[PDB]
Amino acid sequence: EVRTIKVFTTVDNINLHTQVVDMSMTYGQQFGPTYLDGADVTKIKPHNSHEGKTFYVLPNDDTLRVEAFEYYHTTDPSFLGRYMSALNHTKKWKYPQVNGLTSIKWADNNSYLATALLTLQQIELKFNPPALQDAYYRARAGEAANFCALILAYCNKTVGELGDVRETMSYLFQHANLDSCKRVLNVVCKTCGQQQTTLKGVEAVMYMGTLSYEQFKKGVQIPTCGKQATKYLVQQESPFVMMSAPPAQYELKHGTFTCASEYTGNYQCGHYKHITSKETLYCIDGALLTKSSEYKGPITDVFYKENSYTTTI
Ligand SMILES: Cc1ccc(N2CCN(C)CC2)cc1C(=O)NC1(c2ccc3c4c(cccc24)CC3)CC1
Ligand SMILES: [Zn+2]
Ligand SMILES: [Zn+2]
């Protein structure tokens, strides 16, 4: 009447720790908060089928929170719980291959996640947290459920809430290795003069104003010095740039961009689709694929590939 089984506990699914569990007590009474493949089992009692299975638990000793910080690059005590709660849902999403890319069937307002996912497969990016590197590898392969859950946890967003593609990519770039990325800008006035600026990291591969890359290089008008100065790109060193602006009708031409985010609807309650440039223009809407030779639509982000740009101005 006091049976026991052997199981593994973990915080990272890479270091496993053998545990003997009393089948006469719940998991929470022995481990605290405890999860099996996302599902919360803190209040469940052991079952014969759990022998050998692996269980996530919360970092409750020093060894365990070293392993957790080293895999996730966060000390936030709630992070594991949110990741498990998210994963409990995303493991039931469907991740079809669509035009050679892993996508996500629409559920729970996950259009923005799909668009992020599709984009990440088209640009050169190296994540620092091993959790993101391993899940991304899995995602690329076709099984994105851990990756999607990790994004929600890194972003403090829950299943079913629509999020912002630009903001999500900004959170993720903040965990990617962009050290060697450099942008150089110049702002010129008719009255005042040249005021050069330099940026690095995620700020050198992002923008919030215009959706065109040529316009940025040519110049754009922006405000205290005088009135409406011009801002233009002097130098860019990075594998990609991301040009964003509030959604507006916009024409996309094959060969002149890598991919982009179409947004239809109102602020914070709309719908994203993902436009990619391959041999023709494709539109990937979760699990649905359409082709066109041209495109006119409400676009709010555009990714261009890059290596090194130097102005002639
Ligand atoms: C879908 C969504 C989810 C969450 C958010 N949160 C998250 C938290 N953040 C502090 C603020 C905004 C925005 C959008 C959104 O809809 N983002 C877009 C956007 C859509 C529509 C409009 C935008 C405007 C300015 C800027 C962005 C706009 C004016 C009208 C589609 C790109
Ligand atoms: Zn001025
Ligand atoms: Zn490149």
mmCIF file of C-alpha atoms and ligand atoms in Angstrom:
data_model
loop_
_atom_site.group_PDB
_atom_site.id
_atom_site.type_symbol
_atom_site.label_atom_id
_atom_site.label_comp_id
_atom_site.label_asym_id
_atom_site.label_seq_id
_atom_site.Cartn_x
_atom_site.Cartn_y
_atom_site.Cartn_z
ATOM 1 C CA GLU A 1 0.000 0.000 0.000
ATOM 2 C CA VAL A 2 3.096 2.200 -0.167
ATOM 3 C CA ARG A 3 4.171 1.491 -3.749
ATOM 4 C CA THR A 4 6.798 3.604 -5.544
ATOM 5 C CA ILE A 5 7.902 4.292 -9.132
ATOM 6 C CA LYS A 6 11.120 5.815 -10.513
ATOM 7 C CA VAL A 7 10.794 8.934 -12.697
ATOM 8 C CA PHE A 8 12.998 11.733 -14.044
ATOM 9 C CA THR A 9 12.707 15.412 -13.105
ATOM 10 C CA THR A 10 14.205 18.276 -15.033
ATOM 11 C CA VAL A 11 14.034 21.986 -15.723
ATOM 12 C CA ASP A 12 15.523 21.926 -19.229
ATOM 13 C CA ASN A 13 14.877 18.404 -20.578
ATOM 14 C CA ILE A 14 18.657 18.095 -21.056
ATOM 15 C CA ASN A 15 19.801 17.353 -17.488
ATOM 16 C CA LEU A 16 17.649 14.559 -16.039
ATOM 17 C CA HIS A 17 17.488 13.717 -12.319
ATOM 18 C CA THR A 18 16.254 10.355 -11.095
ATOM 19 C CA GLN A 19 13.524 10.441 -8.465
ATOM 20 C CA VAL A 20 11.710 7.745 -6.519
ATOM 21 C CA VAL A 21 8.128 8.873 -5.971
ATOM 22 C CA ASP A 22 5.586 7.644 -3.435
ATOM 23 C CA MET A 23 2.402 6.634 -5.253
ATOM 24 C CA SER A 24 0.530 7.576 -2.031
ATOM 25 C CA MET A 25 1.185 11.315 -2.368
ATOM 26 C CA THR A 26 0.616 13.751 -5.192
ATOM 27 C CA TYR A 27 3.543 15.140 -7.184
ATOM 28 C CA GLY A 28 3.091 18.561 -5.616
ATOM 29 C CA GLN A 29 3.502 17.058 -2.155
ATOM 30 C CA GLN A 30 6.916 15.705 -3.215
ATOM 31 C CA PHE A 31 8.197 18.120 -5.853
ATOM 32 C CA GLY A 32 6.017 21.196 -5.626
ATOM 33 C CA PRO A 33 4.557 22.434 -8.910
ATOM 34 C CA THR A 34 5.160 19.650 -11.417
ATOM 35 C CA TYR A 35 4.343 19.153 -15.094
ATOM 36 C CA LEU A 36 4.141 16.357 -17.647
ATOM 37 C CA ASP A 37 4.308 17.458 -21.311
ATOM 38 C CA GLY A 38 2.725 20.762 -20.387
ATOM 39 C CA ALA A 39 -0.093 19.372 -18.262
ATOM 40 C CA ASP A 40 -0.129 20.434 -14.601
ATOM 41 C CA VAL A 41 0.101 17.302 -12.425
ATOM 42 C CA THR A 42 0.863 18.954 -9.079
ATOM 43 C CA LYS A 43 -2.394 17.603 -7.627
ATOM 44 C CA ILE A 44 -2.421 14.228 -9.423
ATOM 45 C CA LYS A 45 -1.267 11.020 -7.867
ATOM 46 C CA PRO A 46 1.368 8.817 -9.546
ATOM 47 C CA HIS A 47 0.148 6.211 -12.026
ATOM 48 C CA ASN A 48 1.781 3.010 -13.146
ATOM 49 C CA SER A 49 2.254 4.430 -16.654
ATOM 50 C CA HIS A 50 4.494 7.273 -15.446
ATOM 51 C CA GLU A 51 7.462 5.035 -14.608
ATOM 52 C CA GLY A 52 10.402 6.210 -16.721
ATOM 53 C CA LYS A 53 8.605 9.377 -17.940
ATOM 54 C CA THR A 54 10.169 12.829 -17.480
ATOM 55 C CA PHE A 55 8.634 15.663 -15.471
ATOM 56 C CA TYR A 56 9.332 19.388 -15.389
ATOM 57 C CA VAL A 57 9.590 20.918 -11.913
ATOM 58 C CA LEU A 58 10.381 24.366 -10.575
ATOM 59 C CA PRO A 59 13.932 25.393 -9.621
ATOM 60 C CA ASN A 60 13.790 24.879 -5.855
ATOM 61 C CA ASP A 61 17.530 24.349 -5.116
ATOM 62 C CA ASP A 62 20.687 26.121 -6.316
ATOM 63 C CA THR A 63 21.751 23.364 -8.725
ATOM 64 C CA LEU A 64 18.340 23.504 -10.354
ATOM 65 C CA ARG A 65 18.234 27.248 -10.856
ATOM 66 C CA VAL A 66 21.727 27.200 -12.345
ATOM 67 C CA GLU A 67 20.541 24.694 -14.963
ATOM 68 C CA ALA A 68 17.422 26.840 -15.588
ATOM 69 C CA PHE A 69 19.198 30.176 -16.072
ATOM 70 C CA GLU A 70 21.788 28.518 -18.281
ATOM 71 C CA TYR A 71 19.143 27.061 -20.633
ATOM 72 C CA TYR A 72 16.595 29.953 -20.659
ATOM 73 C CA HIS A 73 18.716 33.024 -19.798
ATOM 74 C CA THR A 74 16.161 34.249 -17.325
ATOM 75 C CA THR A 75 15.800 34.148 -13.539
ATOM 76 C CA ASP A 76 12.052 34.996 -13.654
ATOM 77 C CA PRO A 77 10.508 32.512 -11.200
ATOM 78 C CA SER A 78 7.217 32.303 -13.129
ATOM 79 C CA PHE A 79 8.793 31.597 -16.521
ATOM 80 C CA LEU A 80 8.662 27.780 -16.350
ATOM 81 C CA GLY A 81 4.996 27.746 -15.313
ATOM 82 C CA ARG A 82 3.973 30.083 -18.133
ATOM 83 C CA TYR A 83 6.018 28.049 -20.618
ATOM 84 C CA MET A 84 4.323 24.822 -19.524
ATOM 85 C CA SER A 85 0.819 26.380 -19.582
ATOM 86 C CA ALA A 86 1.503 27.698 -23.080
ATOM 87 C CA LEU A 87 3.027 24.374 -24.271
ATOM 88 C CA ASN A 88 -0.057 22.503 -22.956
ATOM 89 C CA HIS A 89 -1.957 24.354 -25.713
ATOM 90 C CA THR A 90 0.609 24.647 -28.556
ATOM 91 C CA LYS A 91 1.296 20.895 -28.527
ATOM 92 C CA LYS A 92 -2.219 20.544 -29.964
ATOM 93 C CA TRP A 93 -1.697 23.083 -32.744
ATOM 94 C CA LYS A 94 -0.997 21.724 -36.220
ATOM 95 C CA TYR A 95 2.238 22.742 -37.949
ATOM 96 C CA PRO A 96 1.826 22.071 -41.655
ATOM 97 C CA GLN A 97 4.613 22.488 -44.161
ATOM 98 C CA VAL A 98 3.363 25.180 -46.530
ATOM 99 C CA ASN A 99 5.568 26.340 -49.443
ATOM 100 C CA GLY A 100 8.655 24.643 -47.965
ATOM 101 C CA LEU A 101 8.185 26.337 -44.569
ATOM 102 C CA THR A 102 6.791 25.299 -41.211
ATOM 103 C CA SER A 103 3.551 27.219 -40.586
ATOM 104 C CA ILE A 104 0.741 26.988 -38.022
ATOM 105 C CA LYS A 105 -2.916 26.216 -38.616
ATOM 106 C CA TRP A 106 -4.970 29.130 -37.254
ATOM 107 C CA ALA A 107 -6.011 28.751 -33.641
ATOM 108 C CA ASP A 108 -6.323 30.968 -30.610
ATOM 109 C CA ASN A 109 -5.330 34.160 -32.488
ATOM 110 C CA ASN A 110 -1.934 32.684 -33.395
ATOM 111 C CA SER A 111 -1.675 34.382 -36.798
ATOM 112 C CA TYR A 112 1.056 36.685 -35.517
ATOM 113 C CA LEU A 113 3.062 33.694 -34.271
ATOM 114 C CA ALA A 114 2.852 31.964 -37.637
ATOM 115 C CA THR A 115 4.041 35.127 -39.409
ATOM 116 C CA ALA A 116 6.957 35.373 -36.981
ATOM 117 C CA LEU A 117 7.761 31.759 -37.424
ATOM 118 C CA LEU A 118 7.657 31.975 -41.292
ATOM 119 C CA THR A 119 9.871 35.063 -41.163
ATOM 120 C CA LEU A 120 12.418 33.486 -38.824
ATOM 121 C CA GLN A 121 12.921 30.710 -41.330
ATOM 122 C CA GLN A 122 13.883 33.250 -44.014
ATOM 123 C CA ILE A 123 16.526 35.377 -42.271
ATOM 124 C CA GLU A 124 19.879 34.628 -40.661
ATOM 125 C CA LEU A 125 19.560 34.731 -36.877
ATOM 126 C CA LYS A 126 21.391 32.980 -34.041
ATOM 127 C CA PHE A 127 19.740 32.751 -30.652
ATOM 128 C CA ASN A 128 21.722 32.914 -27.428
ATOM 129 C CA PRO A 129 19.480 30.931 -25.013
ATOM 130 C CA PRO A 130 19.970 27.192 -25.645
ATOM 131 C CA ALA A 131 16.203 26.783 -25.119
ATOM 132 C CA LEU A 132 15.546 28.957 -28.187
ATOM 133 C CA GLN A 133 18.302 27.328 -30.230
ATOM 134 C CA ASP A 134 17.010 23.797 -29.635
ATOM 135 C CA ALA A 135 13.336 24.628 -30.090
ATOM 136 C CA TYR A 136 14.110 26.611 -33.212
ATOM 137 C CA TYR A 137 15.952 23.591 -34.647
ATOM 138 C CA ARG A 138 12.856 21.494 -33.916
ATOM 139 C CA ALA A 139 10.624 24.167 -35.467
ATOM 140 C CA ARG A 140 12.573 24.232 -38.693
ATOM 141 C CA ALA A 141 12.171 20.480 -38.811
ATOM 142 C CA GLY A 142 8.357 20.644 -38.580
ATOM 143 C CA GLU A 143 7.479 20.467 -34.879
ATOM 144 C CA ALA A 144 7.195 23.998 -33.591
ATOM 145 C CA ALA A 145 5.212 23.469 -30.407
ATOM 146 C CA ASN A 146 8.070 24.067 -27.968
ATOM 147 C CA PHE A 147 9.257 27.107 -29.943
ATOM 148 C CA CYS A 148 5.804 28.727 -30.013
ATOM 149 C CA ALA A 149 5.395 28.143 -26.289
ATOM 150 C CA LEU A 150 8.809 29.670 -25.579
ATOM 151 C CA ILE A 151 7.903 32.814 -27.513
ATOM 152 C CA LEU A 152 4.748 33.284 -25.470
ATOM 153 C CA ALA A 153 6.762 32.801 -22.259
ATOM 154 C CA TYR A 154 9.580 35.108 -23.290
ATOM 155 C CA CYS A 155 6.982 37.727 -24.227
ATOM 156 C CA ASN A 156 4.614 37.401 -21.249
ATOM 157 C CA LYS A 157 1.728 36.622 -23.572
ATOM 158 C CA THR A 158 -0.850 33.908 -23.048
ATOM 159 C CA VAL A 159 -2.573 31.556 -25.457
ATOM 160 C CA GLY A 160 -5.458 33.249 -27.269
ATOM 161 C CA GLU A 161 -4.258 36.856 -27.065
ATOM 162 C CA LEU A 162 -3.351 38.479 -30.401
ATOM 163 C CA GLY A 163 0.151 39.986 -30.269
ATOM 164 C CA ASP A 164 2.227 42.357 -32.411
ATOM 165 C CA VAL A 165 4.676 40.814 -34.898
ATOM 166 C CA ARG A 166 7.112 43.731 -34.707
ATOM 167 C CA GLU A 167 7.121 43.681 -30.893
ATOM 168 C CA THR A 168 7.538 39.909 -30.781
ATOM 169 C CA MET A 169 10.522 40.027 -33.141
ATOM 170 C CA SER A 170 11.972 42.809 -31.026
ATOM 171 C CA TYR A 171 11.780 40.662 -27.896
ATOM 172 C CA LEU A 172 13.420 37.782 -29.731
ATOM 173 C CA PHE A 173 16.150 39.810 -31.410
ATOM 174 C CA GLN A 174 16.971 40.834 -27.821
ATOM 175 C CA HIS A 175 17.935 37.188 -27.240
ATOM 176 C CA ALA A 176 19.802 36.798 -30.518
ATOM 177 C CA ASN A 177 23.450 37.479 -31.246
ATOM 178 C CA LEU A 178 23.388 40.795 -33.120
ATOM 179 C CA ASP A 179 26.625 42.217 -31.658
ATOM 180 C CA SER A 180 28.321 42.678 -35.007
ATOM 181 C CA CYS A 181 25.299 44.582 -36.412
ATOM 182 C CA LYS A 182 25.924 48.255 -37.123
ATOM 183 C CA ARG A 183 23.832 51.043 -38.636
ATOM 184 C CA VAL A 184 25.028 54.575 -39.350
ATOM 185 C CA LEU A 185 22.550 57.425 -39.837
ATOM 186 C CA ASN A 186 22.769 61.088 -40.833
ATOM 187 C CA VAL A 187 20.231 63.817 -40.212
ATOM 188 C CA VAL A 188 20.645 67.032 -42.202
ATOM 189 C CA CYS A 189 18.912 70.416 -41.817
ATOM 190 C CA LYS A 190 18.664 73.346 -44.186
ATOM 191 C CA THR A 191 19.299 75.652 -41.247
ATOM 192 C CA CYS A 192 21.212 73.473 -38.721
ATOM 193 C CA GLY A 193 23.821 70.876 -39.793
ATOM 194 C CA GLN A 194 24.896 67.265 -40.192
ATOM 195 C CA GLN A 195 24.234 65.254 -37.025
ATOM 196 C CA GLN A 196 25.538 61.759 -37.498
ATOM 197 C CA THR A 197 24.424 58.885 -35.228
ATOM 198 C CA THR A 198 25.504 55.258 -34.804
ATOM 199 C CA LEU A 199 23.473 52.260 -33.573
ATOM 200 C CA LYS A 200 24.251 48.634 -32.691
ATOM 201 C CA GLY A 201 22.428 45.478 -31.622
ATOM 202 C CA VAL A 202 18.685 45.181 -32.312
ATOM 203 C CA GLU A 203 18.391 48.939 -32.896
ATOM 204 C CA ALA A 204 20.599 48.704 -35.997
ATOM 205 C CA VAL A 205 18.323 46.130 -37.661
ATOM 206 C CA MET A 206 14.936 47.712 -36.942
ATOM 207 C CA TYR A 207 12.916 50.811 -37.871
ATOM 208 C CA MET A 208 9.432 52.226 -37.272
ATOM 209 C CA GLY A 209 8.280 54.634 -39.973
ATOM 210 C CA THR A 210 8.569 53.624 -43.623
ATOM 211 C CA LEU A 211 8.181 50.184 -45.213
ATOM 212 C CA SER A 212 10.530 50.793 -48.160
ATOM 213 C CA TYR A 213 14.316 50.298 -47.991
ATOM 214 C CA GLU A 214 15.212 52.581 -50.905
ATOM 215 C CA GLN A 215 13.297 55.439 -49.287
ATOM 216 C CA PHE A 216 15.346 55.037 -46.106
ATOM 217 C CA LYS A 217 18.572 55.219 -48.115
ATOM 218 C CA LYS A 218 17.310 58.157 -50.171
ATOM 219 C CA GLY A 219 15.908 59.946 -47.135
ATOM 220 C CA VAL A 220 12.761 60.676 -45.132
ATOM 221 C CA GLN A 221 11.461 63.764 -43.385
ATOM 222 C CA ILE A 222 11.386 63.953 -39.583
ATOM 223 C CA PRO A 223 11.127 66.712 -36.927
ATOM 224 C CA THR A 224 13.241 70.287 -32.421
ATOM 225 C CA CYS A 225 16.000 71.459 -34.744
ATOM 226 C CA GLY A 226 14.455 73.843 -37.335
ATOM 227 C CA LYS A 227 11.453 72.006 -38.819
ATOM 228 C CA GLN A 228 11.322 68.678 -40.767
ATOM 229 C CA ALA A 229 14.926 67.495 -41.279
ATOM 230 C CA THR A 230 15.930 64.521 -43.474
ATOM 231 C CA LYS A 231 17.142 61.220 -42.187
ATOM 232 C CA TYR A 232 19.103 58.883 -44.437
ATOM 233 C CA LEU A 233 21.030 55.618 -44.108
ATOM 234 C CA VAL A 234 24.775 56.083 -44.324
ATOM 235 C CA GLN A 235 25.987 52.554 -43.595
ATOM 236 C CA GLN A 236 24.419 49.201 -42.772
ATOM 237 C CA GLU A 237 26.179 46.018 -41.701
ATOM 238 C CA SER A 238 23.819 43.179 -40.821
ATOM 239 C CA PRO A 239 22.305 40.064 -42.438
ATOM 240 C CA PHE A 240 18.845 41.700 -42.649
ATOM 241 C CA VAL A 241 16.879 44.825 -41.920
ATOM 242 C CA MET A 242 13.260 45.171 -40.760
ATOM 243 C CA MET A 243 11.279 48.169 -41.987
ATOM 244 C CA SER A 244 7.983 48.751 -40.190
ATOM 245 C CA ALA A 245 5.134 51.234 -40.225
ATOM 246 C CA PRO A 246 1.484 51.419 -39.210
ATOM 247 C CA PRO A 247 -0.523 49.373 -41.693
ATOM 248 C CA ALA A 248 -1.213 51.083 -44.996
ATOM 249 C CA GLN A 249 -1.941 50.072 -48.538
ATOM 250 C CA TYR A 250 1.269 49.177 -50.255
ATOM 251 C CA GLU A 251 2.519 47.471 -53.412
ATOM 252 C CA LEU A 252 5.041 44.631 -53.183
ATOM 253 C CA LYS A 253 7.193 43.615 -56.138
ATOM 254 C CA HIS A 254 8.830 40.216 -56.704
ATOM 255 C CA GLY A 255 12.551 40.255 -56.113
ATOM 256 C CA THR A 256 12.656 43.546 -54.205
ATOM 257 C CA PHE A 257 12.066 42.207 -50.699
ATOM 258 C CA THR A 258 12.375 38.963 -48.842
ATOM 259 C CA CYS A 259 9.126 38.780 -46.831
ATOM 260 C CA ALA A 260 6.481 40.954 -45.196
ATOM 261 C CA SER A 261 3.536 41.018 -42.779
ATOM 262 C CA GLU A 262 0.080 41.925 -44.082
ATOM 263 C CA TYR A 263 -2.261 43.186 -41.349
ATOM 264 C CA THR A 264 -6.019 43.538 -41.851
ATOM 265 C CA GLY A 265 -8.475 44.883 -39.236
ATOM 266 C CA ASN A 266 -8.300 47.268 -36.344
ATOM 267 C CA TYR A 267 -5.439 47.837 -33.903
ATOM 268 C CA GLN A 268 -4.973 44.878 -31.531
ATOM 269 C CA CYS A 269 -7.874 42.834 -32.912
ATOM 270 C CA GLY A 270 -7.034 42.191 -36.573
ATOM 271 C CA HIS A 271 -5.352 39.436 -38.536
ATOM 272 C CA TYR A 272 -1.876 38.863 -39.970
ATOM 273 C CA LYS A 273 -0.886 37.118 -43.148
ATOM 274 C CA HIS A 274 2.676 36.546 -44.387
ATOM 275 C CA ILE A 275 3.879 37.472 -47.880
ATOM 276 C CA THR A 276 7.067 35.848 -49.185
ATOM 277 C CA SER A 277 9.058 36.446 -52.385
ATOM 278 C CA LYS A 278 10.414 33.258 -53.989
ATOM 279 C CA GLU A 279 9.975 32.502 -57.723
ATOM 280 C CA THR A 280 6.654 34.379 -57.446
ATOM 281 C CA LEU A 281 4.821 36.230 -54.680
ATOM 282 C CA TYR A 282 3.186 33.900 -52.203
ATOM 283 C CA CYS A 283 0.670 34.619 -49.448
ATOM 284 C CA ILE A 284 0.828 32.177 -46.509
ATOM 285 C CA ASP A 285 -2.171 32.506 -44.204
ATOM 286 C CA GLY A 286 -1.545 29.906 -41.512
ATOM 287 C CA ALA A 287 -2.444 26.674 -43.261
ATOM 288 C CA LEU A 288 -3.648 28.282 -46.492
ATOM 289 C CA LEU A 289 -1.483 29.183 -49.504
ATOM 290 C CA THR A 290 -2.212 31.442 -52.475
ATOM 291 C CA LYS A 291 -0.049 32.661 -55.359
ATOM 292 C CA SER A 292 0.080 35.900 -57.269
ATOM 293 C CA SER A 293 2.466 37.703 -59.588
ATOM 294 C CA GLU A 294 1.700 40.998 -57.907
ATOM 295 C CA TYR A 295 0.382 42.201 -54.583
ATOM 296 C CA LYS A 296 -1.331 45.342 -53.280
ATOM 297 C CA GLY A 297 -2.374 45.253 -49.648
ATOM 298 C CA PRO A 298 -2.127 46.633 -46.089
ATOM 299 C CA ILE A 299 1.479 45.899 -45.100
ATOM 300 C CA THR A 300 3.026 46.736 -41.771
ATOM 301 C CA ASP A 301 6.435 45.035 -41.859
ATOM 302 C CA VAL A 302 8.916 44.210 -44.652
ATOM 303 C CA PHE A 303 12.155 42.271 -44.287
ATOM 304 C CA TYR A 304 15.027 42.869 -46.693
ATOM 305 C CA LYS A 305 18.193 40.793 -46.712
ATOM 306 C CA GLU A 306 21.470 42.707 -46.513
ATOM 307 C CA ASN A 307 25.188 42.292 -45.942
ATOM 308 C CA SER A 308 26.964 45.638 -46.299
ATOM 309 C CA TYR A 309 25.543 48.876 -47.653
ATOM 310 C CA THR A 310 27.396 52.147 -48.126
ATOM 311 C CA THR A 311 25.705 55.302 -49.339
ATOM 312 C CA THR A 312 26.774 57.352 -52.347
ATOM 313 C CA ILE A 313 25.052 60.582 -51.232
HETATM 314 C C1 LIG B 1 -2.211 43.227 -33.391
HETATM 315 C C2 LIG B 1 -1.633 43.917 -32.145
HETATM 316 C C3 LIG B 1 -1.471 43.255 -30.902
HETATM 317 C C4 LIG B 1 -0.893 43.920 -29.791
HETATM 318 C C5 LIG B 1 -0.477 45.265 -29.889
HETATM 319 N N1 LIG B 1 0.071 45.990 -28.769
HETATM 320 C C6 LIG B 1 0.995 45.286 -27.814
HETATM 321 C C7 LIG B 1 1.645 46.190 -26.704
HETATM 322 N N2 LIG B 1 2.195 47.463 -27.223
HETATM 323 C C8 LIG B 1 2.674 48.314 -26.085
HETATM 324 C C9 LIG B 1 1.151 48.221 -27.885
HETATM 325 C C10 LIG B 1 0.377 47.479 -28.978
HETATM 326 C C11 LIG B 1 -0.657 45.855 -31.159
HETATM 327 C C12 LIG B 1 -1.229 45.238 -32.255
HETATM 328 C C13 LIG B 1 -1.353 45.880 -33.560
HETATM 329 O O1 LIG B 1 -2.414 45.909 -34.126
HETATM 330 N N3 LIG B 1 -0.219 46.284 -34.297
HETATM 331 C C14 LIG B 1 -0.260 46.811 -35.662
HETATM 332 C C15 LIG B 1 -0.832 48.126 -35.823
HETATM 333 C C16 LIG B 1 -2.133 48.041 -36.297
HETATM 334 C C17 LIG B 1 -2.902 49.199 -36.463
HETATM 335 C C18 LIG B 1 -2.557 50.432 -36.176
HETATM 336 C C19 LIG B 1 -1.213 50.542 -35.623
HETATM 337 C C20 LIG B 1 -0.926 51.803 -35.350
HETATM 338 C C21 LIG B 1 0.208 52.376 -34.857
HETATM 339 C C22 LIG B 1 1.020 51.231 -34.676
HETATM 340 C C23 LIG B 1 0.741 49.839 -34.956
HETATM 341 C C24 LIG B 1 -0.450 49.423 -35.490
HETATM 342 C C25 LIG B 1 -1.965 52.885 -35.669
HETATM 343 C C26 LIG B 1 -3.095 51.877 -36.243
HETATM 344 C C27 LIG B 1 -0.683 45.777 -36.698
HETATM 345 C C28 LIG B 1 0.782 46.406 -36.608
HETATM 346 ZN ZN ZN B 2 17.051 71.892 -37.765
HETATM 347 ZN ZN ZN B 3 23.389 37.731 -45.928
#
